[PDB]
Design a protein around this ligand. Structure first.
Ligand SMILES: Nc1nc2c(ncn2[C@@H]2O[C@H](CO)[C@@H](O)[C@H]2O)c(=O)[nH]1
Ligand SMILES: [Zn+2]
Ligand SMILES: [Zn+2]
Ligand SMILES: [Zn+2]
Ligand SMILES: [Zn+2]
Ligand SMILES: [Zn+2]
Length: 311
């Protein structure tokens, strides 16, 4: 039997977003492909190495490390276990024959939801709650702020780094404070912490924007959209490659054109004018007409010092 193991990050498989979507894709892979799937949650980074080792020792054909913080542990395990195949989501630093890097152009989807936030705010203040700061996480920020400003040059983006992907209290408190200070749309790129962000928006009667999966069921009257990142499909696809015997190492990048990132399929709360505007911007990115900044220098060159979490 083909066995695929998932090592999840601190967020947990019930995060409503990143890890939950990765796991959902593996559950689908089990149903459709016949692979046997199991996950191991890591309470802290001390659990990364033994969780990887447990799948190695049990004969798993592929170990999927979900999240950029697993990179160091994945590299070390891949070097020490040349016959073991690994995949890692959201980090592309590892160049080894047994490692596939699954990357997502999240700045593209974040830009689109920033257009939504800029067009929907009535106070000209919107919020961004990020789970941690890192190169990949800042791509959410750069895209979102660029979208907000392109849609609404006079909008202010309030920003907060929760320093956790698994703290719903931090998410709720930060959202509530932003709302007290006038924000009326809040986007999170914060994993499980975002469950708190969404609850804070719902409680205050404001708009939220979710991430990774279509988070609208968590607050159907308050979610405008979500910046989708199809970690489910990427995990399914690599499971398929394992089953077929054609896993390739290196970088696989999922973008808007590949449908690997997107805005959510639920659009019930988007005015037709807004949906049309965002959909045109999506096709312009897909067709190459416009490019979203995803690094500090590119973002600052166009928007100045307005992203405060990268300094
Ligand atoms: N390293 C890591 N990143 C996460 C986690 N949860 C969310 N993220 C990131 O935050 C984004 C928004 O949830 C995801 O697409 C990931 O990039 C987690 O538990 N660990
Ligand atoms: Zn658990
Ligand atoms: Zn089926
Ligand atoms: Zn607090
Ligand atoms: Zn799915
Ligand atoms: Zn900055």
């Amino acid at each position: 039997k083909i066995k695929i193991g998932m090592v999840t990050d601190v967020g947990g498989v019930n995060d409503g977003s990143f890890n939950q979507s990765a796991w959902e894709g593996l559950q689908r892979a089990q149903k459709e492909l016949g692979v046997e799937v199991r996950y191991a949650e890591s309470a802290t980074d001390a659990d990364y190495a033994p969780n990887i080792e447990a799948f190695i020792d049990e004969g798993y054909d592929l170990i999927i490390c979900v999240g950029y913080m697993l990179a160091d542990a994945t590299r070390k395990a891949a070097e020490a276990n040349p016959n073991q195949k690994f995949a890692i989501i959201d980090d592309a630093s590892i160049d080894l024959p047994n490692v596939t890097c699954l990357m997502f152009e999240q700045s593209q989807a974040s830009y689109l939801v920033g257009l939504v936030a800029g067009k929907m705010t009535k106070t000209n203040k919107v919020g961004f709650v990020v789970g941690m700061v890192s190169q990949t996480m800042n791509e959410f920020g750069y895209g979102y702020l660029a979208g907000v400003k392109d849609a609404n040059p006079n909008a202010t983006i309030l920003q907060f780094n929760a320093n956790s992907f698994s703290s719903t209290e931090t998410g709720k408190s930060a959202a509530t404070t932003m709302i007290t200070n006038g924000a009326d749309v809040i986007f999170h790129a914060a994993g499980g912490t975002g469950l708190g962000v969404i609850e804070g928006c719902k409680d205050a009667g404001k708009w939220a924007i979710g991430v990774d999966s279509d988070q609208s069921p968590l607050a159907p009257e308050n979610i405008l959209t979500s910046a989708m990142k199809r970690v489910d499909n990427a995990c399914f696809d690599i499971a398929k490659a394992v089953k077929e015997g054609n896993v390739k190492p290196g970088i696989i990048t999922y973008d808007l054109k590949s449908a690997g990132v997107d805005i959510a399929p639920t659009t019930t709360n988007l005015p037709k004018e807004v949906l049309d505007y965002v959909n045109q911007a999506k096709q312009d990115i897909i067709n190459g007409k416009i490019t979203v900044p995803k690094t500090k220098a590119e973002f600052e060159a166009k928007y100045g010092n307005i992203y405060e979490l990268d300094d």
